[PDB]
Design a protein around this nucleic acid. Structure first.
Lengths: 441, 437
RNA sequence: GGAAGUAGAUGGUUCAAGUCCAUUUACUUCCACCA
RNA sequence: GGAAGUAGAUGGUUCAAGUCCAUUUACUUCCACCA
């Protein structure tokens, strides 16, 4: 299979077919009629209005253009008022910028209020660049919309499409900019192989530059890094994907993998081969949006992780899962059990004052002089990493993220061994320990 | 109690009785005759020849004065013959400088060939300072002989008297200098408390001066560090014992403290209480003098310790013992068992050539990326500190001292649990673990 | 909500804290939720 | 025999270890065995 042949087949995975374009076309018209009837300024932007949305995930963005002078609170009431007035059914869940999600004639719509600006310098709301993004792309993306989709499907299938916190990947917009820059998906990929953590792509200036971090300049706002929330590791994954793809291209790369059911037994055997302690801290899921949730789960992971490390449990890797009603903070450590006694350092032998303060303390064991300074043996209050975290999470819940922290305080438990393998975390477990052959399609 | 009171009763244990004195006096009379019907130039030196030896251990030092043109050839051969022809029974074991050790009418004697110089500068044989030590000390010590005797007794009861590598403590010539310097035992203990690791003591200039490290200057060799072999930790032990003695003076500071050994079962209980892995590497004690052995054992000890720590077993401390037949290298780790899997660091995601290489290796688990570099899981070859040191000891014998390495090469074993507790290391295991009572 | 910087104030730990664990006031950004 | 210092000779481990683990020559001391 030549590289150009795989792509022709890959287009079938990404070009929306007619039924979905029509559904979209008549959703759009209905939207128009409704927003006309209300006599409001609106515009269609995003992937629908540029024809770069993916087969299977049609969503229309309608943007409301308000006077710059409106208060943030006004922007909010009116935005919602109109969004609610126009959608067949709706749902309002956001993290900071207010907008309403909904459905019109079976199709998904964001209706998002923003400020009508003359320039996208000194943005007032965080969505203000969007109409300009559209304006800039409108006539550079014609005839390339399929190169965009290839890139989006390619990233989607390797789980790095989306700039949201759940993903820390590539936005659709970022994808569009890349095609405008390179000219095709193929050219994008060919070049990505040479991207580095210092790479700066400046599209408006048509230039690739070195800098302090991976930076993709927005043509609409030179200060914006379109790749701001692309995690370093996902960058590295993408360049790698590219290098692999060029060497051995297949339809594989455009097909997504789904984790496999793993018998809790295979899982038991694997864990005892590695000879490690594995456990999750399980707690009720705070009822909040993903974009609030995930940073906090990351915070929790790290915080506990660093505890495990400084208490010498030598943790290998951490992971986390949000499920329907619970969350899980997963860890794997090299030390299943540590000794009760440990060393604590005292002062040098010349500090009469402090030494005699130091060996004042009542201890089970005679303290000793080494390398000219004193040393004491103390007892740990926990000897296994599970006990360690039972203590840590009970007493440091406040540090663990505002919402998860409050959750952990109210309740949590530590699960390990087989009780843990029957829990919906096998996917993360395999991923975390790098278990071979546990994903598919 | 009141302090001078304490010294009174304590003098009785450092001072030799007429019984022991006479014993020497007449062994000295025999010596003086036997040496003079051979026309060999000689002088007596050391604690014997300045009335500063201890109740118990009595030794006599006889020094053979030799012409300087004599090579290390004629020095050894003649100087040995002489002692061999003077003593009743003798040994000739030594590390560098040759001498003969022996018995004359039931008392300990040392006869030592050396050069009769005039200048101690540009020294020839290792001991040549010693007759000059005496010349300097002869009349200077007169009176203060008791105050010396107290210092030695104090150090011996607290196990820090001597200079040999077994003790790395205080030479009995350093002990004399301190008394000479500070006047008495009480003033010596008094100022010791205020010594630092950089204290510099000079006697032929009487200056409590400071410098680069703990350096007591010999009168007869300005450039000689009489405290050279005193270990930092033992200097640290001394100035603390002094601070302790001063606050609560007791007879038990001259009573050699005995670690009356502990039951294999009370030991067992303690280690499971501490919850750590204690074990020893045991091998055939090489046939070498102490002053060769211990530095070597220290070396062997340290290398394994360092292995263990970089291997992440978190060793607590080391020790070592040498018996009739065997040496023991003792260790305690916080980690009885580590996981099989571990983390190996790959290159950074950019370096394409090296990534391929890192990825080409067969492993049981997929490698991963973390903060922009590749990592892999790999498997350990050992998971307990015992198995670990078995490996290190087999692979690295050559680096564990000349004679101790060779011995471990032939044979060694890893010794732990109750098998270990019935080996003659009970005392050192305590000292090491900080056990009380 | 999360992260980065600035100017601080606390508590705990420890012989010892500008250096470890945490708490907290003010300013300055920035990211996610739309693109 | 151990330690310190001067100029080098490698081998093993590893994606690469000029940095991790060891091997080896020349030279300049020091220290213990007596005090």
């Amino acid at each position: 299979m030549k590289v150009e042949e795989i792509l022709e087949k890959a287009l079938e995975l990404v070009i929306p077919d007619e039924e979905e374009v029509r559904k979209g076309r008549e959703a759009e018209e209905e939207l128009r009629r409704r927003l006309d009837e209300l006599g409001v300024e609106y515009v269609f932007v995003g992937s629908y209005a540029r024809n770069t949305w993916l087969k299977g995930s049609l969503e229309i963005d309608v943007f409301l253009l308000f006077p710059e002078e409106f208060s943030k609170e006004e922007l909010r009431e009116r935005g919602l008022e109109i969004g609610k007035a126009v959608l067949d059914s709706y749902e309002i869940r956001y993290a900071e910028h207010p907008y309403v999600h909904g459905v019109v004639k079976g199709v998904e719509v964001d209706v998002v209020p923003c400020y009508k600006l003359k320039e996208p310098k000194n943005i007032k709301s965080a969505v203000d660049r969007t109409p300009f993004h559209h304006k800039w792309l409108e006539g550079r993306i014609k005839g390339k919309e399929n190169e965009v989709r290839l890139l989006k499907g390619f990233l989607k299938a390797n789980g790095i499409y989306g700039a949201e916190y759940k993903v820390r990947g590539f936005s659709g917009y970022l994808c569009e900019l890349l095609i405008v820059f390179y000219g095709s998906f193929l050219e994008t990929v060919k070049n990505a192989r040479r991207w580095t953590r210092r790479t700066v792509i400046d599209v408006a200036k048509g230039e690739v530059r070195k800098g302090e971090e991976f930076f993709v300049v927005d043509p609409v706002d030179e200060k914006r890094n379109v790749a701001a929330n692309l995690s370093l590791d996902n960058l590295a994954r993408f360049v790698h994907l590219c290098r692999e793809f060029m060497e051995a291209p297949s339809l594989g790369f455009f097909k997504p993998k789904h984790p496999l059911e793993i018998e809790p037994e295979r899982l038991r055997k694997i864990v005892e081969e590695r000879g490690t302690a594995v456990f999750a801290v399980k707690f009720r899921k705070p009822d909040i949006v993903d974009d609030n949730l995930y940073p906090q789960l990351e915070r929790a992971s790290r915080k506990i992780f660093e505890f495990l490390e400084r208490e010498n449990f030598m943790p290998l890797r951490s992971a986390f899962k949000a499920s329907e009603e619970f969350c899980y903070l997963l860890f794997e450590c090299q030390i299943k059990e540590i000794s009760r006694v440990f060393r604590r350092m005292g002062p040098q032998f010349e500090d009469e004052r402090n030494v005699k303060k130091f060996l004042s303390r009542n201890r089970a064991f005679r303290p000793f002089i080494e390398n000219g300074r004193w040393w004491a043996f103390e007892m740990r209050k926990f000897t296994t990493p599970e006990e360690g975290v039972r203590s840590y999470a009970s007493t440091h819940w406040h540090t663990l993220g505002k919402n998860v922290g409050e959750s952990i305080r109210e309740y949590f438990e530590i699960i390990s061994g087989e009780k843990l393998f029957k829990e919906p975390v096998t996917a993360e477990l395999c991923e975390m320990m790098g278990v071979k052959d546990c994903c598919c399609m």
